[PDB]
Structures are given as C-alpha cells and as structure tokens.
Design a protein around this ligand. Structure first.
Ligand SMILES: [Cl-]
Ligand SMILES: [Cl-]
Ligand SMILES: [Mg+2]
Length: 77
C-alpha cells in the first residue's frame, strides 16, 4: 500500500539508509516522504563530514540537494 511504497521510496532515495532508519524518519514527518528524505540526507552527510548538522544542511544546499556530490566534496582532501 501507500505506506510500504513510501518507506521504500525513502530507503531508495538516500544512500546508506536502513529500512529501520527510513521508517523512523517517515514516522517523524507523519508520512511526508520529501521531508523524511531531506532529514535523512542531512543525517548521512552530517555523519560522513562530522561537521555541525546545520553545516551539513548548508553543504547539501550548495550541492543542490545532491547527496552524492556533497559527500564527494566533504571527502575530498
Ligand atoms: Cl532533499
Ligand atoms: Cl569533483
Ligand atoms: Mg520492519
């Protein structure tokens, strides 16, 4: 149904996210897939960059919400 489809969409939209993390994120947004994906992308980048969560958000914005591009940026030496 809708809820299964939504959890799958979240999990497939964010590299590295588990099914459990997708469910938790979507529960926190009341089933709003777009907000769950945003929050999970920030989370993933935050854990990869060990920056502040607001700085991870700012990097994601600079990369036009592309987590792959933002992640390659934070990992570049
Ligand atoms: Cl996003
Ligand atoms: Cl590059
Ligand atoms: Mg389960």
């Amino acid at each position: 149904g809708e809820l299964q489809r939504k959890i799958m969409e979240v999990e497939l939209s964010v590299h590295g996210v588990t099914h459990q993390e997708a469910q938790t994120a979507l529960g926190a947004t009341g089933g709003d897939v777009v907000s769950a994906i945003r929050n999970l992308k920030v989370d993933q980048l935050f854990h990869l960059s060990s920056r502040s969560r607001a700085d991870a958000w700012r990097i994601l914005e600079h990369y036009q919400w592309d987590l792959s591009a933002a992640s390659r940026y934070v990992l570049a030496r």
